[PDB]
């Protein structure tokens, strides 16, 4: 129950891999989603991929 704008969500820090699965990365603004989650955790350098 909120409005999500990716204009604020653009490059904040240098983004090494902004990879998206199943959705065009530049089209998330127009599309309408359902029950979006949010995650946060830190991994070592060589295990990013």
């Amino acid at each position: 129950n909120c409005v999500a704008d990716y204009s604020v969500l653009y490059n904040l820090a240098p983004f090494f891999t902004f990879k998206c699965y199943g959705v065009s990365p530049t089209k998330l603004n127009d599309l309408c989603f359902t029950n979006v989650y949010a995650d946060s955790f830190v991994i070592r350098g060589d295990e990013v991929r």
């Binding site: 199943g22 065009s24 530049t26």
Partner: protein, 49 residues
């Protein structure tokens, strides 16, 4: 035989029209959703399929 001919024709038409729902190994069976959720470079494969 007269009813058999009509039954065969109806079965063929119904099979053809119901075939549309097949995903054929793609994300979805509707063209608009696929064209809207992805960029052309990756959507070309699905459209061709």
């Amino acid at each position: 035989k007269l009813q058999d001919v009509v039954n065969h024709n109806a079965q063929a038409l119904n099979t053809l029209v119901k075939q549309l729902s097949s995903k054929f190994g793609a994300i979805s069976s509707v063209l608009n959703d696929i064209f809207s959720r992805l960029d052309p470079p990756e959507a070309e494969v699905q459209i061709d399929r």
